[PDB]
Amino acid sequence: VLLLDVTPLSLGIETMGGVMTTLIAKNTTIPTKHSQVFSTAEDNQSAVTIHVLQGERKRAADNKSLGQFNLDGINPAPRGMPQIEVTFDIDADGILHVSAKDKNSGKEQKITIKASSGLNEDEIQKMVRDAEANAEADRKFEELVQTRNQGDHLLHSTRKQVEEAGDKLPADDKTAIESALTALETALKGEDKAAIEAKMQELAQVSQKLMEI
């Protein structure tokens, strides 16, 4: 064949830290279908937002929003435990169906997105050019968010361990841990990945007795 229908830009969702995670790559022939299992960002999360995006940028905010829906009724559980199946299905008419199903509860929500939605030909070309021109910056942002997500999880897991230990943790140790947690919390708001990793290292240096507990 000399011609066929494609989806002209990557399609995906916003994930933890404001990144776009792709489900369907740009120039994939249609009809097409792809599913991926996701989970919760924090402990006791009973709802997730499925924010549908079109584009090639690593920052979710830089892509074209196609729509969004919430999936509620998730049984509150530790982060990473729920299995949320997200499915992207584009029919032969270019109509996009996006669904999210929580495997444990069976709860499901879906949205239909019209073929005319999204970016036009000129906006597509500009999206591709802008993604190429900002390739190093988008990769640096992606690396920052991955370090931020680990730091955020370290903040929660350490705070949980401190309350669990209580009296078992000596005063000198708890003091140092709390001081390192504040320094880590501050670094996480910044955009220097090495500064966050360094605060994570400093926290590990004062958490040795908390780890034995």
């Binding site: 916003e14 997730v48 499925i50 299995q83």
Partner: peptide
């Protein structure tokens, strides 16, 4: 391994 979703 699975990627994570926020609650908005």
């Amino acid at each position: 391994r699975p990627i994570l979703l926020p609650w908005r």
